[PDB]
Amino acid sequence: KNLILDFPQPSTDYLSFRSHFQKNFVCLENCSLQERTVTGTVKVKNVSFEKKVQIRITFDSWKNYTDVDCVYMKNVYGGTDSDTFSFAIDLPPVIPTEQKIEFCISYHANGQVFWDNNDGQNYRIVHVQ
Ligand SMILES: OC[C@H]1O[C@@H]2O[C@H]3[C@H](O)[C@@H](O)[C@@H](O[C@H]4[C@H](O)[C@@H](O)[C@@H](O[C@H]5[C@H](O)[C@@H](O)[C@@H](O[C@H]6[C@H](O)[C@@H](O)[C@@H](O[C@H]7[C@H](O)[C@@H](O)[C@@H](O[C@H]8[C@H](O)[C@@H](O)[C@@H](O[C@H]1[C@H](O)[C@H]2O)O[C@@H]8CO)O[C@@H]7CO)O[C@@H]6CO)O[C@@H]5CO)O[C@@H]4CO)O[C@@H]3CO
Ligand code: NA
């Protein structure tokens, strides 16, 4: 593939997921690349009924960015402490090697704003030869 995720999927590293989720109230859960689409899920702490969960993504080293709405997905077996939101983002026909593709996650609820920015580095998608 000419594109890989430059980070481990948090759902495969539960101890790291749990720490970040408890601290930030939002954390990326799944992320995968298939056929120039990036898809995944986000877990949020259930602090209010109405929620706005977005991926903020750049394809040009933050010269510009797009906010993409995530969609609530009820788990029939889920609890009430957290909620899961999905996203699906089509990638550009070609992506840069000289610029960076990076994203982070925002969560608006209860008059508060929470973010997952991967410890200040954002989540990077890198090119492969
Ligand atoms: O019935 C009481 C309820 O009535 C009013 O709410 C109605 C609202 O005004 C309508 O617009 C519509 O809701 C739509 C909504 O406006 C849209 O934005 C969208 O909603 C999405 C959410 O934004 C998104 O967060 C997610 O929602 C899921 C939650 O994430 C998840 O946690 C769970 O929600 C449960 C709450 O966590 C829990 O607290 C409890 O909610 C109570 C509220 O806290 C309380 O304020 C009151 O709610 C009023 C509301 O204020 C009125 O405006 O009572 C609630 C019940 O006790 O229970 C929640 C449900 O289990 O689940 C939700 C998904 O159901 O996804 C949604 C969907 O995309 O779409 C909404 C639906 O069209 O209808 C509601 C009434 O149903
Ligand atoms: Na919403």
Numbering used by the authors: 132 to 260
List passages from the publication reporting this PDB structure:
PP1 is directed to its different pathway-specific substrates by scaffold proteins; PPP1R3 are those orienting PP1 towards GYSs and PYGs. PTG is composed of 317 amino acids with a structured central region, containing a carbohydrate-binding module 21 (CBM21, residues 133–261), flanked by largely disordered regions.
The domain is organized in a β-sandwich of eight antiparallel strands (β2-β9) divided into two β-sheets, with an overall immunoglobulin-like fold. On one side of the sandwich, the N-terminal region forms a short 310 helix immediately followed by an α-helix and connects to the C-terminal segment through an additional two strands short β-sheet (N-ter β1 and C-ter β10). The four chains (one in the orthorhombic crystal and three in the asymmetric unit of the monoclinic system) are identical with an average rmsd of 0.36 Å (over Cα atoms). In the PTG CBM21 crystal structure, the β-cyclodextrin molecule binds at the interface between symmetry-related copies occupying site I in one chain and site II in the other. In site I, half of the cyclodextrin molecule lies on the shallow tray generated by the β4-β5-β8-β9 sheet together with the β4-β5 and the β9-β10 loops. Major van der Waals contacts are with Arg187, Trp193, Tyr196, Cys235, and Trp246 together with H-bonds directed to Arg187, Asn248, and Asn253 side chains. At site II, the cyclic oligosaccharide inserts in between the β3-β4 and the β6-β7 loops with a close net of H-bonds connecting it to PTG residues Asn177, Phe180, Glu181, Lys182, Asp214, and Tyr203 (this last being water-mediated); additionally, extensive van der Waals contacts are present with Lys182, Tyr203 and especially Phe180 that, inserting in the cyclodextrin ring, becomes fully buried. The observed interaction at site I configures then as a crystallographic interface or as an ancillary carbohydrate-interacting site, which binding to glucose chains is cooperatively reinforced by the dominant interaction at site II; while site I shows some sequence divergence, all site II residues are conserved in PTG, GM and GL. Analogously, we measured a KD of 59 ± 5 μM with a 1:1 stoichiometry by ITC titration of PTG CBM21 with β-cyclodextrin.
